[PDB]
Amino acid sequence: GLMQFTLPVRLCKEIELFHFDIGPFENMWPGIFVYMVHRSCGTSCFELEKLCRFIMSVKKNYRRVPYHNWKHAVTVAHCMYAILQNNHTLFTDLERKGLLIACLCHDLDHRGFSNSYLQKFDHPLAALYSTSTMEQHHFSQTVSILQLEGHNIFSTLSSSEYEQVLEIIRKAIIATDLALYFGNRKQLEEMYQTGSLNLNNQSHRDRVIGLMMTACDLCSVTKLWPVTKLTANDIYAEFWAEGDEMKKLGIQPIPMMDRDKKDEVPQGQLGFYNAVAIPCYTTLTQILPPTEPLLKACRDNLSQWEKVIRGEE
Ligand SMILES: Cn1nc(-c2ccccn2)cc1NC(=O)c1c(C(=O)N2CCC2)cnn1C
Numbered sequence: 001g002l003m004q005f006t007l008p009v010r011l012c013k014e015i016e017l018f019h020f021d022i023g024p025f026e027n028m029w030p031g032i033f034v035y036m037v038h039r040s041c042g043t044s045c046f047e048l049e050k051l052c053r054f055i056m057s058v059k060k061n062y063r064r065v066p067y068h069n070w071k072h073a074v075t076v077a078h079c080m081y082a083i084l085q086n087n088h089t090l091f092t093d094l095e096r097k098g099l100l101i102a103c104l105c106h107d108l109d110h111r112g113f114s115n116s117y118l119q120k121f122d123h124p125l126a127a128l129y130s131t132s133t134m135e136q137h138h139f140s141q142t143v144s145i146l147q148l149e150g151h152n153i154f155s156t157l158s159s160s161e162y163e164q165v166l167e168i169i170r171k172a173i174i175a176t177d178l179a180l181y182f183g184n185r186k187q188l189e190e191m192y193q194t195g196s197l198n199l200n201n202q203s204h205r206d207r208v209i210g211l212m213m214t215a216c217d218l219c220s221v222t223k224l225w226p227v228t229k230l231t232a233n234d235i236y237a238e239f240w241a242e243g244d245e246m247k248k249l250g251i252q253p254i255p256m257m258d259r260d261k262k263d264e265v266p267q268g269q270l271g272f273y274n275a276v277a278i279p280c281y282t283t284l285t286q287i288l289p290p291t292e293p294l295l296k297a298c299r300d301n302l303s304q305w306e307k308v309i310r311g312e313e
């Protein structure tokens with residue numbers, strides 16, 4: 001109870017910034033997450049023994065894939081932490097509990113293949129969940145771990161608080177399906193500009209939390225250039241493996257997944273920054289002004305990819 005988690009001085013300061021990189025020391029990531037829960041939610045919101053056991057079961061259920069791994073889970077949780085700490089008074093006690101957990105669990109048991117590849121392979125999960133296939137699986141796996149003996153971090157919540165927090169986690173994890181992002185942001189853009197956006201309207205909060213999840217999920221594009229650039233390698237390592245698997249099904253994959261069309265990556269990043277990242281952090285900055293550093297960092301990395309195309313690197 002009086003056992004505060006503390007980080008070394010450089011991490012203690014840099015962890016508060018949107019562009020923080022959790023580092024290459026795997027064995028610090030759990031302490032970094034507990035640190036963020038303690039500052040974000042309180043030392044009192046989870047039994048430390050249950051939290052520790054939950055974290056380690058969640059780690060165990062991420063696979064050793066190049067990108068959709070335990071480092072991604074904690075990276076997405078830190079970006080959420082930075083949004084919550086810069087917007088203290090806009091979120092309920094339960095939202096602060098639910099969302100960090102939602103981010104840690106959002107890619108649980110990912111194999112490094114898109115929903116499309118599951119559908120074209122005819123994977124069993126594609127029959128169980130016809131849309132947002134992996135995202136429904138990630139939520140299911142989250143519930144599975146919450147029901148392991150001594151893993152129920154929400155045990156002390158009321159019956160209705162418990163249903164609310166699991167509802168927050170479910171919607172948050174579903175919204176990480178990039179197919180749902182486009183429509184969610186257009187709606188949020190209209191609502192903001194017509195001045196109909198109302199954070200007391202639960203359906204409106206749902207949409208805003210969904211945008212926050214897309215923002216945290218895409219947060220590799222908001223780091224220092226060398227983090228952004230080296231993360232892109234891991235992202236494309238999965239994409240190209242999926243491209244290979246598409247070829248094995250007798251299907252020419254999209255260029256994004258074709259390791260023969262490696263030359264087209266710079267332009268592909270421009271497309272992605274312009275079609276997805278920039279609009280996401282733009283709309284997010286309009287709704288949550290203190291998140292502007294994400295938009296600023298994203299724009300800086302766009303300019304870096306523009307420099308790559310111009311052969312200045
Ligand atoms: C959409 N798209 N298209 C190209 C592209 C197109 C043509 C040629 C080369 N590349 C690249 C991307 N996406 C990303 O690069 C990306 C994602 C992402 O889409 N997902 C889904 C799993 C995470 C996330 N973070 N980042 C940087």
Ligand SMILES: [Mg+2]
Nearest residue numbers: 106107134176
């Ligand atoms: Mg995902």
Ligand SMILES: [Zn+2]
Nearest residue numbers: 072106107217
């Ligand atoms: Zn993710």
